[PDB]
Amino acid sequence: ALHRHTNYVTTSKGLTLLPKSDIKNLVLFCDEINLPKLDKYGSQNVVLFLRQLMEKQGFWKTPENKWVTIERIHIVGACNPPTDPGRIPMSERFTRHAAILYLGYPSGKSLSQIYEIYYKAIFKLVPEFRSYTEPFARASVHLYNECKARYSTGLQSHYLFSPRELTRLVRGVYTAINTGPRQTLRSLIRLWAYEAWRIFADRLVGVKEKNSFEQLLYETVDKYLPNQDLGNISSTSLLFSGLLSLDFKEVNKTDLVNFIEERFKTFCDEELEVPMVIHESMVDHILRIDRALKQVQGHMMLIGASRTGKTILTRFVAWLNGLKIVQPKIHRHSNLSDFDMILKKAISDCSLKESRTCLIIDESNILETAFLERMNTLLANADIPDLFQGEEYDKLLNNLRNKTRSLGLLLDTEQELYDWFVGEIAKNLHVVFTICDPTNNKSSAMISSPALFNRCIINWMGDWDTKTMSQVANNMVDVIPMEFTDFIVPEVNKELVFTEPIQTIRDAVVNILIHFDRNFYQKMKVGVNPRSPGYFIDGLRALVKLVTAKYQDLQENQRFVNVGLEKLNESKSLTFEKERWLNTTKQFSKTSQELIGNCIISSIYETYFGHLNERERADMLVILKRLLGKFAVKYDVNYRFIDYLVTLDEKMKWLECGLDKNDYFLENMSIVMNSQDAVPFLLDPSSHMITVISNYYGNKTVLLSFLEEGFVKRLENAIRFGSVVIIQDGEFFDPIISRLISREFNHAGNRVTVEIGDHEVDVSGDFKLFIHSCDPSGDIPIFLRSRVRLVHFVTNKESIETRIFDITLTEENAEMQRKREDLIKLNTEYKLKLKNLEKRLLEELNNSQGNMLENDELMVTLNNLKKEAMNIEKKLSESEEFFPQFDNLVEEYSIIGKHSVKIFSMLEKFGQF
Amino acid sequence: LWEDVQRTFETPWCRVDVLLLQSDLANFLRRADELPRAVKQFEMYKSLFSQVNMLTSVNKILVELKDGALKPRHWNMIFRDIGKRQIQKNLLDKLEFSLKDVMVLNLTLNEILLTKIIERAQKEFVIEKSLNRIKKFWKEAQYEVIEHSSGLKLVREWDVLEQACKEDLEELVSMKASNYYKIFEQDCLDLESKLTKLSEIQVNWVEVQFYWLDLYGILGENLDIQNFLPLETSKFKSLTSEYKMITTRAFQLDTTIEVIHIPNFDTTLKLTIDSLKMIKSSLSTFLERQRRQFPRFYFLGNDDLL
Ligand SMILES: Nc1ncnc2c1ncn2[C@@H]1O[C@H](COP(=O)(O)OP(=O)(O)O)[C@@H](O)[C@H]1O
């Protein structure tokens, strides 16, 4: 930092000095002087360097070992009180040399005058309300005071208020008045309220504190600006934006939503394609991000939860304002030099070319504290001196000197050139941090950092509320047909319903999905929910595709039965009894009513239960069934996921490939294979699945890992020639595969292209990706975990609970165990072979149009089909009594297993010791 | 205008540019109406306007078939399966057919089969681009040469080319998984064969060069040690002479890959490395025989003992 303003010199008695470059004295303002961390032995070296500079008046060059005597350079530091969090105490050996001055807040009453001067300044644009300069200021000050007392650090660690918030509010009020239309008192009050919302209540967490701030705003307005014509001051009730008009005026909600939709469609088309649904919170946050990006040093920190839309929302808002989006393409083996080069390129584009970039820094786009320090230096100043120093400085000053000449402005001094450079960076570079969970150590360090927290506008997206989920679901379940279930409006409590009052099956579906998501997060997740619905969206998409597929299947079966009935009605003595056995047209009416319920259960099972135990799956399935029963949607009472989704052929293929006989493993494999809209993440301690998948894909399987050096290239081959990829490690993850984890491709005429690192590679279309992990203890990045279909292949303790049953019933009721398996086995093979015989009969009738000798085979097969009809009826009648007895018999051996699992837990604890 | 539009219809497809074609079609549309009614009543103006409207009706098709992925094989398939005719091979292989043929193919209707064949065209070009990149890289690769005290030439930076050869071999292996590999098999197989031979020569060469450097410090410099081991140094001098001739003839080629065509190169390097390993074993046995006579030499090592 000193290299720009200091000039090393040499003298015989004056071995190298480091004085001013100019003739003016130099004052080193070291802000946050007590912030740097201290070594493990308890000594922070930067403070000792400062003491050396103030006591010894010099230091030692580390390459050359020469005493450098600083000349007429002064040291002025600034520090928060040591009692503040993160403030390391400073040694008395350093502060012994410095005069300490305490600067408190300006008394709380002087703030009134200090900002009344600002309001008198900014009301020169609107003289008609000159007399309102004094009220506003007091109100503003009062607001600040209240927000300082209500929202303390005890609630949230980022609830730090200061007069800087008041200055931001005054600048916002001016920059809305300056570019706004002719104003009225109601308009000014609403404008001030909007700016107050954006300054004080953006960082607030939870609807309780937002409502508290809203009532505080109402009280302040009624106390200091007792106007009589005002609307609702809620966050979504007032919307100020210059996207529609050329001014900055409060816009109607409907026009804003229509414009946002018609622009978002174009953005999804011409830019990267991600099918997305527009809702009210999206519009509000688009306005917030637009306001932040519009100002000069507009940096934002979006603290939400994964899969909320923050990154793509920032990209959309940048595209609206014509900002070049730059995202650091870093990976696991990316060091500080790569980040420095990326920042250098971004700065060069920002200044030497006036590119107006928008650097989106994710939480995972920083790996060590050096990246965060680079962000601090870039944000606190408007430049990073460490990038441009030494000879690289000499080039920069050259590139400035040419460039500043091309703009028609003359600047020959180095200081003037660098000041123009800093100003261009400040007014052209916007940094938008996006962090998923703020309780993580990296994200907590990002938030608590002084430069970021003081320069960035903390916008707390948070997780989706029930209104946003209802809007998204309504816009997502409006594509699939539901004109066959014959829904009847059910009687439910007003608290249970989330969308508009239930009048159709679609509202019931969205209510069930929202309620199950809430219950699932209530059971699995504890305390606060830093997880935004990615399960909800994936479940909605799965339900859409599954309803479509199941209705197509039902249509095909109905068509087959109807054409068979028509053929039989066209048809010599026993076919009248196949008129009876074609009563399945009556069964179709019952099985079509339960189609939506079965599809909901199967989609929820595919999405949520991938990473659950054998008992958690049962409990949450019971919860989902009681939720379906709470509303008026029906489902197959004896529903089995394996029977419903996977067919016999696929199950036999999986068993042949090497999969176990467990129902848990069959369900896990069904989840892995059936759901291929998202990458599957197979977790298993034994690697027995890695071979199984390979056995499924023969010679096409390619095994990689995130540890080997050539992996980055090898995938680029497998991704270009269509070979199934299994990555042996998943706990590690280099974000270069990021554009592959989320299906975010660059389409063209007929070639689909994906960006990996900085290479664009063509996707064959035969390429699958399975991520595989071994240790369940290992963690996966929040970006990966919420995008990927996590499937647990572990053999938990609860696997004992069922397994001993299959032993007990084997040696306690041998005949009952024998009938249990063959009941379902014969049932399934009957549902296949009766259809087989029906199409046999149909094609035989096709071949028996007018012959007589051929009818003997027709008659004998007609008599045959009666046998399987009797067996089907007998099996159904026997099951009607077997299932009650089976469920009665389950509970006894469940009692046995309750002790068995405890015993095994104790044994495993012993083994752990 | 009729002469101009007839001339623009006869330009070879290998030279047609859509950017100027758009302006030319705009001019044709502008100048169609200004023709007098004598042209309008005749078939000349009607045919001209119909052909101009045919050209302007499809413009995505023209730019898609202007892509580099298209090849004479694809043009032959398009002509045979859509145009129902055969194109002269000289007219086809150079893509010099006129725009009238493109009109004949009737891009408006057969666009579904057109896109079906173009998709195959881009995938085959995905394979061909990797093949061309590998060939271009290995037609310009060369070692980095230095000269030490002796007249021998030494290679530096083995990795920058060894890793490239290994990665290219892995790429050529992985190309077999692609469905559209059959047409490119006859070239990929030969390229893989050449790269395997080059990789074997590289593996022998790095070891030969390393062992020769290691032994040059021991033998060939100190006269005393060569006197204690006359057979070893006598063999070493002949090895150095043969290696010098081999390396001079090898770097007289300006390309790394062409060493696979040098007569008796890989076997020569195998013999050289075998003889160097035998000389190293002889040194080890001599040093151990010296240490077993005065065992305190076990506290010194090899360089000190030498
Ligand atoms: N309104 C919405 N409609 C549909 N899907 C959405 C919506 N908002 C977010 N999503 C889903 O959440 C993801 C958000 O993407 P992105 O913003 O890039 O990641 P992050 O939210 O973690 O920053 C998208 O993949 C999208 O599928």
From Swiss-Prot, chain A:
Principal cellular location given in the protein's record: cytoplasm
Subcellular location: Cytoplasm, Cytoskeleton
Region (AAA 4): 266-528
GO biological process: cytoplasmic microtubule organization; establishment of mitotic spindle localization; establishment of mitotic spindle orientation; karyogamy; mitotic sister chromatid segregation; mitotic spindle organization; nuclear migration; nuclear migration along microtubule
Chain positions recorded as ATP binding sites: G304, A305, S306, R307, T308, G309, K310, T311
Positions of the UniProt region annotated as AAA 5: 645-874
Keywords from the named record: ATP-binding, Coiled coil, Cytoplasm, Cytoskeleton, Dynein, Karyogamy, Microtubule, Motor protein, Nucleotide-binding, Repeat
GO cellular component, one term: cell cortex
Single Gene Ontology MF annotation: dynein light intermediate chain binding
Residue ranges of coiled coil: 807-883
Chain positions covered by the region annotation AAA 3: 1-172
Similarity comment: family membership: Belongs to the dynein heavy chain family.
Note: Present with 195 molecules/cell in log phase SD medium.
Quaternary structure annotation from Swiss-Prot or TrEMBL: The dynein complex consists of at least two heavy chains and a number of intermediate and light chains. Interacts with DYN3.
Entry note about domains: Dynein heavy chains probably consist of an N-terminal stem (which binds cargo and interacts with other dynein components), and the head or motor domain. The motor contains six tandemly-linked AAA domains in the head, which form a ring. A stalk-like structure (formed by two of the coiled coil domains) protrudes between AAA 4 and AAA 5 and terminates in a microtubule-binding site. A seventh domain may also contribute to this ring; it is not clear whether the N-terminus or the C-terminus forms this extra domain.
Stated role: Cytoplasmic dynein acts as a motor for the intracellular retrograde motility of vesicles and organelles along microtubules. Dynein has ATPase activity; the force-producing power stroke is thought to occur on release of ADP. Required to maintain uniform nuclear distribution in hyphae. May play an important role in the proper orientation of the mitotic spindle into the budding daughter cell yeast. Probably required for normal progression of the cell cycle.
Listed name of the protein: Dynein heavy chain, cytoplasmic
Organism, scientific name: Saccharomyces cerevisiae (strain ATCC 204508 / S288c)
Lineage of producing organism: Eukaryota, Fungi, Dikarya, Ascomycota, Saccharomycotina
Name of the coding gene: DYN1
Coverage span on the entire protein: 2457 to 3638 of 4092
